[PDB]
Amino acid sequence: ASAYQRFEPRAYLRNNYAPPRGDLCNPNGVGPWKLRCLAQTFATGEVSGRTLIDIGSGPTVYQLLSACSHFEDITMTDFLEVNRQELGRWLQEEPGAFNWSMYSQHACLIEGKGECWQDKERQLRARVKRVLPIDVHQPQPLGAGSPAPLPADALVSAFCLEAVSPDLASFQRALDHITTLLRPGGHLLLIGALEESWYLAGEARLTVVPVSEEEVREALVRSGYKVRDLRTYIMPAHLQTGVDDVKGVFFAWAQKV
Amino acid sequence: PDSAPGQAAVASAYQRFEPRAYLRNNYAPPRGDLCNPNGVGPWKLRCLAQTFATGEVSGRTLIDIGSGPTVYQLLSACSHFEDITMTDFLEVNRQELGRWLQEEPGAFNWSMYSQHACLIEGKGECWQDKERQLRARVKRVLPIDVHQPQPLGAGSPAPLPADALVSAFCLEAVSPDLASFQRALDHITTLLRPGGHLLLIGALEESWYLAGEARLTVVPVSEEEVREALVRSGYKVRDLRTYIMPAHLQTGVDDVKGVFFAWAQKVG
Numbered sequence: 258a259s260a261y262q263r264f265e266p267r268a269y270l271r272n273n274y275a276p277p278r279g280d281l282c283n284p285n286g287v288g289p290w291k292l293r294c295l296a297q298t299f300a301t302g303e304v305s306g307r308t309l310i311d312i313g314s315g316p317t318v319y320q321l322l323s324a325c326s327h328f329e330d331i332t333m334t335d336f337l338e339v340n341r342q343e344l345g346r347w348l349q350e351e352p353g354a355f356n357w358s359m360y361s362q363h364a365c366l367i368e369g370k371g372e373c374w375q376d377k378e379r380q381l382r383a384r385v386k387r388v389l390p391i392d393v394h395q396p397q398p399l400g401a402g403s404p405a406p407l408p409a410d411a412l413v414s415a416f417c418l419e420a421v422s423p424d425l426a427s428f429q430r431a432l433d434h435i436t437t438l439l440r441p442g443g444h445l446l447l448i449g450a451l452e453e454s455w456y457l458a459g460e461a462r463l464t465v466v467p468v469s470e471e472e473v474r475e476a477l478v479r480s481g482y483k484v485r486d487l488r489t490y491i492m493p494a495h496l497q498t499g500v501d502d503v504k505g506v507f508f509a510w511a512q513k514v
Numbered sequence: 515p516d517s518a519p520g521q522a523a524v525a526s527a528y529q530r531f532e533p534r535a536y537l538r539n540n541y542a543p544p545r546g547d548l549c550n551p552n553g554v555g556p557w558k559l560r561c562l563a564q565t566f567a568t569g570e571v572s573g574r575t576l577i578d579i580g581s582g583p584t585v586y587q588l589l590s591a592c593s594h595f596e597d598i599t600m601t602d603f604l605e606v607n608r609q610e611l612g613r614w615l616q617e618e619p620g621a622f623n624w625s626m627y628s629q630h631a632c633l634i635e636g637k638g639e640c641w642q643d644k645e646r647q648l649r650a651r652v653k654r655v656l657p658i659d660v661h662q663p664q665p666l667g668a669g670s671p672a673p674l675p676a677d678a679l680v681s682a683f684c685l686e687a688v689s690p691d692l693a694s695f696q697r698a699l700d701h702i703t704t705l706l707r708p709g710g711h712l713l714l715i716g717a718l719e720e721s722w723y724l725a726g727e728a729r730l731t732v733v734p735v736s737e738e739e740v741r742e743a744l745v746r747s748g749y750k751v752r753d754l755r756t757y758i759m760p761a762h763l764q765t766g767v768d769d770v771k772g773v774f775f776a777w778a779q780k781v782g
């Protein structure tokens with residue numbers, strides 16, 4: 258909460274999206290697995306519409322690489338100004354931007370439509386209309402007079418809720434909050450840490466609520482979703498690096514009813 | 515008649531061939547643009563990928579004829595051959611390949627090509643692994659002159675006869691006339707085992723191209739002239755496709771009208 262005031266974007270990108278965790282060459286890593294989950298889901302053709310909002314974007318864009326060709330209006334979000342700034346640098350191809358090209362390349366590989374990674378990035382940059390503040394702890398996470406088209410046809414969120422909640426109940430409530438952003442029938446792609454209790458972001462040490470796959474499932478059900486898919490990636494030893502105590506990564510494809 | 519004159523002219527002209535300018539001319543945009551699938555680059559890689567994808571072209575040893583300063587022509591090939599020989603007439607080109615082999619920063623950057631080849635091969639291979647494997651499998655870089663009856667010389671280092679040949683934009687670019695071209699095709703053919711395969715890529719109806727100061731005179735050939743030459747040398751033509759160069763890609767770096775890709779198997 259106040260702890261997020263020390264959160265360092267570059268340290269976070271370093272710890273999670275640079276080697277080893279960010280190596281994409283080996284298909285058994287967390288990176289390729291996450292991209293794979295995202296791509297397979299959209300390749301189904303069942304997740305579609307006009308508008309999409311990414312909840313708790315942080316300083317990362319990989320979570321939208323497969324989504325962007327299915328949604329012409331995209332809203333990115335985060336609670337921190339610094340994350341939003343870091344997003345801006347990439348979206349505007351400004352100097353010092355993080356280099357997401359490995360991931361863009363990999364989404365292209367996985368998707369298998371012969372697309373060059375540059376076309377992929379252009380499209381993503383083209384369809385992201387706005388980068389907005391957000392606080393999942395608020396009943397109206399986006400605020401009141403949001404420039405964001407509501408309700409969204411679809412939601413994405415990776416490593417936010419559990420990462421910003423002290424306990425299960427808070428986790429459950431935050432999920433309720435963002436769900437009100439989602440149109441009935443809409444879709445939610447939720448990615449997150451399993452059985453994690455802390456992670457580091459430079460000088461920031463974040464407290465995390467440790468959640469299990471069944472708990473995530475139950476929270477989704479409790480929030481009014483049908484769970485279409487819930488998969489688990491177990492974190493191999495060589496990717497336990499001192500930056501957290503994550504045990505695994507869950508991917509959930511839920512649909513609002 | 516006498517082949518020494520024409521060959522002498524060609525050797526004289528190539529002394530001015532500039533690898534960086536040539537690379538810039540043909541492998542940087544717009545000709546190098548890999549994003550448009552209708553562009554020449556994507557078409558070349560695609561011809562190679564699909565040929566190797568048949569699984570019908572394999573063995574232990576491969577020789578790339580007239581490599582120049584480029585490696586793209588081996589990207590799809592390298593997963594099918596343990597031992598690859600690269601070759602060029604010009605030391606400056608050989609040095610260029612040397613820089614890429616050592617993975618120096620000053621080396622020309624081929625990774626867009628490596629990536630694109632990974633993309634269309636469709637095995638989810640990252641481009642660093644593809645590159646890593648090409649570097650490992652290139653066992654030597656050798657001088658060569660396709661006009662000599664033994665293009666690699668006598669007692670060459672190369673494992674002979676090779677199981678397969680690749681050759682991109684070499685023969686026509688160094689043969690003053692059709693007979694020269696034919697003779698050259700004959701010479702490289704002696705390097706290949708019977709039943710082996712040759713993958714030939716080249717310019718169609720081109721009479722000149724630029725490589726810096728060097729402006730080289732090319733023998734313009736047609737698809738049919740190419741086919742007959744392959745037959746004349748002892749090959750069965752398995753595949754001969756043509757790409758017509760788009761007007762927007764005719765940049766004044768040459769007068770190429772199109773590009774040919776031949777898949778030929780040496781009779782035996």
Ligand SMILES: Nc1ncnc2c1ncn2[C@@H]1O[C@H](CSCC[C@H](N)C(=O)O)[C@@H](O)[C@H]1O
Nearest residue numbers: 313314315317336337391392393415416421
């Ligand atoms: N109260 C709150 N409401 C909404 N987002 C918050 C929040 N407190 C912190 N965040 C954001 O939650 C994110 C967790 S990490 C960033 C995750 C990123 N989506 C990726 O996939 O790697 C951080 O960007 C953090 O700034």
Ligand SMILES: Nc1ncnc2c1ncn2[C@@H]1O[C@H](CSCC[C@H](N)C(=O)O)[C@@H](O)[C@H]1O
Nearest residue numbers: 580581582584603604659660682683684688
């Ligand atoms: N007499 C000869 N015998 C064999 N190769 C020759 C030659 N004279 C010039 N060459 C080489 O023929 C090449 C033509 S350029 C094509 C290079 C590369 N294979 C490509 O795909 O882009 C030049 O590298 C040139 O140095």
Ligand SMILES: Nc1ncnc2[nH]cnc12
Nearest residue numbers: 273416420450456501503
């Ligand atoms: N909080 C976290 N823990 C483990 N892996 C992550 N990847 C992104 N955020 C993470």
Ligand SMILES: Nc1ncnc2[nH]cnc12
Nearest residue numbers: 540683687717723768770
């Ligand atoms: N000499 C040449 N002419 C036309 N296109 C080429 N691509 C590579 N070399 C070429």
